[PDB]
Amino acid sequence: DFDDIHRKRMEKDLNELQALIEAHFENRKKEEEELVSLKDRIERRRAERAEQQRIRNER
């Protein structure tokens, strides 16, 4: 009936919506991984700046 096609329509709506939901989940997840790697290289930069600054200060 009209209820049947309405149900199938909201069904495929839910399907595409959860699909895009998981999709942006994955996208923002990759972005968070990239940002974590950024933080890691950032702490590497902090450590290297600290050691070279300390060497400069020692001399």
Partner 1 sequence: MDAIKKKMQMLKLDKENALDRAEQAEADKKAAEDRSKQLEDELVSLQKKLKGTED
26-59 b/e (C-beta count within 10 Å ≥ 16 → b) = eeeeeeeeeeeeeeeeeeeeeeeeeeeeeeeeee
| Token reading at 51 | 């050691």
Minimal distance, residue 47 CB to partner 1, in Å: 36
Contact with partner 1 (CB under 8 A) among 12, 18, 27, 39? 18
Contact with partner 1 (CB under 8 A) among 2, 5, 8, 10? 10
Binding footprint of partner 1 on the chain (CB under 8 A): 3, 10, 13-14, 17-18, 20-22, 24
